[PDB]
């Protein structure tokens, strides 16, 4: 489904649909799991496509600000979207 670099909203228990990219393509009958880099907080994690959702295609469904540590900063980082930290 997804390539590397691809922007999405990753969902995990605890937190809302958080803005993120893929930053390692998986291989390739896989780990079953894309490595993900969460914007603003710069966390990483693995997740199923279950928990994925492309960014532009569900931009305004999930793109509401949020009052969470580093969310509206993640939202800002697109904008600069291959940020490093």
Secondary structure (H, E, C), the chain: CCCCCCEEEECCCCCCCEEEEEEECCCCCCCCCEEEEECCCCCEEEECHHHCCECCCCHHHHCCCCCCCCHHHHCCCCCCCCCCC
Q: How was this structure determined?
A: X-ray
Query: Would you say 81 and 7 are in contact if contact means Cβ atoms under 8 Å apart?
Result: yes
Per domain, the residue ranges of the chain are 6-83
Which residue, among 27, 42, 54, has the nearest Cα to 17 in the 3D structure? Answer: 54
- Residue 72 to residues 29, 60, 76, Cα–Cα distance (Å): 36, 14, 6
How many angstroms is the resolution?
3.3
Q: Which residue's structure tokens are 């960014």?
A: 55
- Tell whether residue 3 is among the known ligand binding residues: no
- Tell whether residue 67 is among the known ligand binding residues: no
- Tell whether residue 61 is among the known ligand binding residues: yes
- Tell whether residue 33 is among the known ligand binding residues: no
């Amino acid at each position: 489904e997804y390539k590397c670099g691809d922007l999405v909203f990753a969902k995990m228990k605890g937190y809302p649909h958080w803005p993120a990219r893929i930053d390692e393509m998986p291989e390739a009958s896989t780990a079953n799991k894309y490595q993900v880099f969460f914007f603003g907080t710069h966390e990483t994690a693995f997740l199923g496509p279950k928990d994925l959702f492309p960014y532009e295609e569900s931009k305004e469904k999930f793109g509401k600000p949020n009052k969470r540590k580093g969310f509206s900063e993640g939202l800002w980082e697109i904008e600069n979207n291959p940020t490093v930290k």
